[PDB]
């Protein structure tokens, strides 16, 4: 079956996992354990990084038979294409492309300060700007059931992940955007999504690696 | 005609520009000037950031009639889809997806240290690792004329940009990979690309913004 390599954490593999489950894909997981500080030993991965036959060795990676893939968004499109979740109309594809990258940006913005030793200092400013960021997603979604349009796409997994990570960071952050909350309900309401969230496989934390100042555990 | 907003620099708009020219697309450019230090006044853009009707106000952006787009990779796919340069076969799309993101990573890696005030100190390490990064691209391309396969795709523009930025940073960097040099020859060898490189429109520098430590001018 398919095999998804990644750290023994949520991180970037989250949306993928969620996607794999929703698509009822058959897959295994090669979770890599990172050593404790101050070393943060990553040999478990490095002693296999270049033996998997990946073109650009990295985490996460996906191995589907002869197909060795890296880069989260690439892995998602790969899985999505097999289930027509990459968009169909012209406008659908545009929205998918924009979000695919937008979420990636917002995700890093968060991860940047969370990995920053001076995290406690930067937090006040980040929170001040967050409402605006969230608002943007709200404006974008509008009265649509999903982000791409009427049909769910892989970007809905990416958007969810981001929004979830934020209700976790600042719980009240979503209160001002009812439609976004409905999105989360609607998303977590999906059959296979709900079932998986209740299974032993569900790994919502640690949000980041051990090197993080926040969500490291 | 189409309109491409961005800073009065190379940056992320480079590959786009290159793509637009090769596609013989009709377009204008809304270059935004950033103020000198220590303020780096960005008012010229901020006083118009939210009036363009962009979903996620950002630079670069592309306006094609009713279509307002942001996110470099999104803009590229938009332009590419109009000219069938987004890939066709399954393997083609995979490669496109991987590179589309890989290049973005390598580009930031460069941009990160060049914007880092302690640039001179980090440089030795970055150069030590670069050969391997380059090697990967070499390994990937192989005997193929283009990265996606036999046909040129928008990623060849993204890969070129990255490679170019590095021969500029470290000229001898490519000497060890002849196939990558042939790629640059073959790319700058394209009729519309060559013509554009010789026109008044060509803007190879500044590589980055004024806030940069390297390639700021
Ligand atoms: N754009 C890449 C970024 C991947 C990346 O930097 N992954 C980090 C984890 S978030 C990693 O630990 N990679 C393993 C390594 O650097 O060897 C993606 O989406 O896969
Ligand atoms: N992932 C984005 C990066 C966008 C970005 O941060 N662009 C810079 C220049 S490289 C910018 O000036 N953005 C305007 C802003 O965020 O105000 C893309 O490819 O569009
Ligand atoms: Zn990470
Ligand atoms: Zn930039």
Curated annotation (Swiss-Prot), chains A, B:
Q: Give the UniProt entry's GO cellular component terms.
A: cytoplasm; cytosol; intercellular bridge
Predominant location category = cytoplasm
Q: Which keywords annotate this record?
A: Cytoplasm, Lipid metabolism, Phosphoprotein, Transferase
Residues bound to glutathione are 6-7, 42-45, 49, 58-59, 71-72
Domain of life, per UniProt, equals Eukaryota
Q: Which Enzyme Commission number(s) are on file for it? A: 2.5.1.18
Residues where substrate binds: 115
Task: Report the residues modified as Phosphoserine.
Answer: 209
| Post-translational modification Phosphothreonine, affected residues | 33
Domain GST N-terminal: residue ranges: 1-87
Tissue specificity, per the record, is:
Liver (at protein level).
Q: Which reaction does it catalyse?
A: RX + glutathione = an S-substituted glutathione + a halide anion + H(+); prostaglandin A2 + glutathione = prostaglandin A2-S-(R)-glutathione; prostaglandin J2 + glutathione = prostaglandin J2-S-(R)-glutathione; prostaglandin J2 + glutathione = prostaglandin J2-S-(S)-glutathione
Gene Ontology BP, a term: glutathione derivative biosynthetic process
Q: What is the effect of changing residue 6 to F?
A: Reduces catalytic activity 100-fold
InterPro entries given in the database record: Glutathione-S-Trfase_C-like (IPR010987), Glutathione-S-Trfase_C_sf (IPR036282), Glutathione_S-Trfase (IPR040079), Glutathione_S-Trfase_N (IPR004045), GST_C (IPR004046), GST_mu (IPR003081), GST_superfamily (IPR050213), Thioredoxin-like_sf (IPR036249)
- Can you tell me which family this protein belongs to? Belongs to the GST superfamily. Mu family.
State the PANTHER family in the record. Answer: GLUTATHIONE S-TRANSFERASE, GLUTATHIONE S-TRANSFERASE MU 1
Q: What does this protein do?
A: Conjugation of reduced glutathione to a wide number of exogenous and endogenous hydrophobic electrophiles. Involved in the formation of glutathione conjugates of both prostaglandin A2 (PGA2) and prostaglandin J2 (PGJ2). Participates in the formation of novel hepoxilin regioisomers.
Q: Cite the record's note on assembly.
A: Homodimer.
Name by which UniProt lists this protein: Glutathione S-transferase Mu 1
Native source species: Homo sapiens
Q: Which gene encodes it?
A: GSTM1
């Amino acid at each position: 079956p398919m095999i998804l390599g990644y750290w023994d954490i949520r991180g970037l593999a989250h949306a993928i996992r969620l996607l794999l489950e929703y698509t009822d894909s058959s897959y295994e997981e090669k979770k890599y354990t990172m050593g404790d500080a101050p070393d943060y030993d990553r040999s478990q991965w490095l002693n296999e990084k270049f033996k998997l036959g990946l073109d650009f060795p990295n985490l996460p990676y996906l191995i589907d038979g002869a197909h060795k893939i890296t880069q989260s968004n690439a892995i998602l499109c790969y899985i999505a294409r097999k289930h027509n979740l990459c968009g169909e109309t012209e406008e659908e594809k545009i929205r998918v492309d924009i979000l695919e990258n937008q979420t990636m940006d917002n995700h890093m913005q968060l991860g940047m300060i969370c990995y920053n030793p001076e995290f406690e200092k930067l937090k006040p400013k980040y929170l001040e700007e967050l409402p605006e960021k969230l608002k943007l997603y709200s404006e974008f979604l509008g009265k649509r059931p999903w982000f791409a349009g009427n049909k769910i796409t892989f970007v809905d997994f990416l958007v969810y992940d981001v929004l979830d990570l934020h209700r976790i960071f600042e719980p009240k952050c979503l209160d001002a955007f009812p439609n976004l909350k409905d999105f989360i309900s609607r998303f977590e309401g999906l059959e296979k999504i709900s079932a998986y969230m209740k299974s032993s496989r569900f790994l919502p934390r640690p949000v980041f690696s051990k090197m993080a100042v926040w969500g490291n555990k």
